[PDB]
């Protein structure tokens, strides 16, 4: 249905941007909105016919166009910190006859004054305790991703090279480190709960993965640290049993038994060659 | 349209309402927006009546000038934001602001505890964990400024048909202990604080044991070497009894 | 990309080691140390190296419609024929050693005299 591009976007004060909306179900008229905490959805522009465009309710700073009957792009003339919001796109057939809209997935923007505030996250994994295993026979892992700005991450869990969706819970909204300041960083967490006899295998592989969106390959960087770009950050752990007898140690036992029985087999073949040769010499001396 | 959360027990009937005084509209609809997503159309009507879609049912009062919605057999798969909408025969569908809705589950057998999770050896934090509650419990934030507390959430593990409540706390500073952590909140009496005297069952660890093909082959080669030692040793006895017996 | 389009796909349930070639084509060809070792159509997009316990090495390429790629060198060392030296290992070794040389020596003494 209705698609749009990009998903997330970072841009500095005084830097224009163009973001798309495409449509293939042969409808004719579209719109743009912005959604805010405490204000709701508010209209920006619309276009009932191919070539004729109208204004809305907060259009101050947004230019539009209409070339074909499927594309309807949006342009920003410059940047302001009042532009930070979430933008949606709508679609209907013709002019108040059948009142069904269809929205897109959205687009996030933050606007900073300076690019020396952008940081990537830091991920760490915390293994489960034994009081929970001996009490309830279940095991929970905790993944923390801390210290990032802007807030453009996505989190996932991958047990043995495949994703999981069952038994997982992530926070809905990222928290702030100090909620007193203006340019403050963020933090976010997630859980995976698993039965006890699945954690106790030493053959299982668990990892947490965070996808970050930041700068790109077009921007000046006068700062000492590495230029924060789009990357994946991750953290692993093997499952492990603390007491008892696993198949980590059975290999140890079998290896030492093979080497000792080979050594003994060599010594015994030496002795057999010896007394066989001695009975050959006495056999020569019988005649 | 009324803001603010409304917390509903599981398996009940939900009542919402919007006012539009005063105009004359026809087309009435509802949208459902999950967290970090876009809206989605549920129910579409422009007459007075009842158009069911299963467990969804709305009612429209033309002269009383308000609409409503009713959900029966409510699940935890319904927690969202609900936007009511109306318009003329012209363009510009006019929207309300929506109403955050939360549904809390059935929590059959509680067992509250606060655990200490094993450290990372790559970051210098420590985490505590306060698990299943009975859903009446409230969790309040920290009084301090270096102890970060999350809110509570529900997870669903379908391999054992079980569900639960959780909350996580972490900190950098020293003198941080999992008995002082959730002090700012009210607590159920008789929680469970573990002792450092560890306990590791052994007959539970043996139900998770595997086998490669290489372990099979290496064990069989051991069983070969034992038979070779018995035959060669029997030969050595017979020859040395030949030389010692004469 | 810079003509780098061979990647390793790891950590499966079985110890399988797989390669995936990034080309928007069909009938992908594989090589090793310069000569051909494979040929593979669609519905199978992943060459197979076997288990990681045999710890493979070498250099691998893939080409589709255009020219060949730049190589990748694999190097696994996942030791698995390793014994640690404990008290138990050295004690068992010395005990079996002494008692074997003792029994053989008693036998030779009774043979000679």
């Amino acid at each position: 249905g209705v698609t749009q591009t990009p998903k997330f976007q970072v841009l500095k004060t005084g830097q224009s941007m163009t973001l798309q909306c495409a449509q293939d179900m042969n409808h004719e008229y579209m719109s743009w909105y912005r959604q805010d905490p405490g204000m709701g959805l508010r209209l920006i522009h619309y276009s009932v016919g191919a070539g004729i465009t109208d204004q809305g309710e907060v259009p101050n700073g947004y230019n539009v166009s209409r070339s074909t009957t499927e594309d309807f792009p949006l342009r920003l003339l410059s940047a302001a910190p009042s532009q930070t919001s979430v933008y949606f796109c709508a679609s209907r057939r013709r002019q108040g006859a059948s009142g069904e809209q269809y929205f897109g997935p959205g687009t996030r923007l933050t606007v900073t004054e300076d690019l020396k505030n952008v940081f990537p996250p830091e991920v760490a994994v915390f293994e489960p305790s034994e009081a929970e295993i001996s009490h309830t026979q279940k095991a929970t892992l905790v993944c923390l991703a801390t210290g990032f700005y802007p807030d453009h991450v996505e989190l996932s869990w991958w047990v043995n090279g495949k994703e999981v969706h069952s038994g997982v819970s992530t926070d809905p909204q990222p928290l702030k480190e100090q909620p007193a300041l203006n340019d403050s960083r963020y933090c976010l967490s997630s859980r995976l709960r698993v039965s006890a006899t699945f954690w106790q295998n030493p053959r299982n592989h668990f990892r947490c993965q965070v996808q970050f969106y930041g700068l790109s390959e077009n921007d000046e960087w006068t700062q000492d640290r590495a230029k924060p770009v789009t990357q994946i950050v991750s953290a692993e752990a093997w499952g492990r049993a603390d007491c008892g007898f696993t198949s980590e140690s059975y290999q140890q036992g079998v290896l030492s038994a093979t080497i000792l029985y080979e050594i003994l087999l060599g010594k015994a073949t030496l002795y057999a060659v010896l007394v066989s040769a001695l009975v050959l010499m006495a056999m020569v001396k019988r005649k | 349209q009324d803001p603010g959360p409304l917390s509903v027990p599981e398996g009940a009937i939900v009542s919402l309402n919007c006012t539009y005084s005063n105009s004359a509209f026809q087309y009435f609809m509802w949208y459902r927006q999950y967290s970090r997503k876009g809206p989605e159309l549920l129910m579409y009507t422009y007459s007075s009546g009842n158009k069911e879609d299963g467990r969804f049912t709305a009612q429209v009062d033309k002269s009383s000038k308000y609409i409503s919605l009713f959900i029966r057999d409510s699940q935890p798969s319904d927690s969202a934001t609900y936007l009511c909408a109306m318009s003329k025969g012209y363009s510009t569908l006019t929207f309300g602001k929506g109403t955050m809705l939360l549904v809390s589950p059935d929590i059959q057998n509680p067992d509250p505890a606060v655990y200490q999770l094993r450290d990372s050896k790559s970051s210098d934090k420590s985490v505590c964990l306060f698990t299943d509650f009975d859903s009446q419990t409230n969790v309040s934030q920290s009084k301090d400024s270096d102890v970060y507390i999350t809110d509570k959430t529900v997870l669903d593990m379908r391999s054992m048909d079980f569900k639960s409540n959780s909350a996580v706390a972490w900190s950098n500073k020293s003198d941080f202990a999992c008995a002082n952590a959730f002090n700012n909140s009210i607590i159920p009496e008789d929680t469970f604080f573990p002792s450092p005297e560890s306990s590791c069952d052994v007959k539970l660890v043996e139900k998770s044991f595997e086998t490669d093909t290489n372990l099979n082959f290496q064990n069989l080669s051991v069983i070969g070497f034992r038979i070779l030692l018995l035959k060669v040793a029997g030969f050595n006895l017979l020859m040395t009894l030949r030389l010692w017996s004469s | 990309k810079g003509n780098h389009l061979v990647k390793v796909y790891d950590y499966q349930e079985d110890g399988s080691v797989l390669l995936t070639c990034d080309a928007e084509a069909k009938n992908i060809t594989w090589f090793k140390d310069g000569k051909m070792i494979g040929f593979l159509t669609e519905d199978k997009k992943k060459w197979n190296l076997g288990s990681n316990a045999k710890d493979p090495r070498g250099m691998y390429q893939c080409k589709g419609s255009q020219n060949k790629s730049k190589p990748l060198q694999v190097y696994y060392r996942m030791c698995q024929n390793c014994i640690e030296l404990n008290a138990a290992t050295i004690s068992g070794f010395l005990f079996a050693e002494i008692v074997s040389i003792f029994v053989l020596a008693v036998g030779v003494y009774f043979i000679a005299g």
Binding site: F245, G253, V254, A257 | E206, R226, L237 | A96, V103
Partner: peptide, 29 residues
């Protein structure tokens, strides 16, 4: 028991207990 150390220690005792017997079975015979 799963731990095969008990099987191998069972082998050596029954292995060194055969020599002594045979050795003492020929001291009388």
């Amino acid at each position: 028991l799963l731990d095969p150390k008990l099987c191998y220690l069972l082998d050596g005792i029954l292995f060194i207990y055969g020599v002594i017997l045979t050795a003492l079975f020929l001291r009388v015979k």
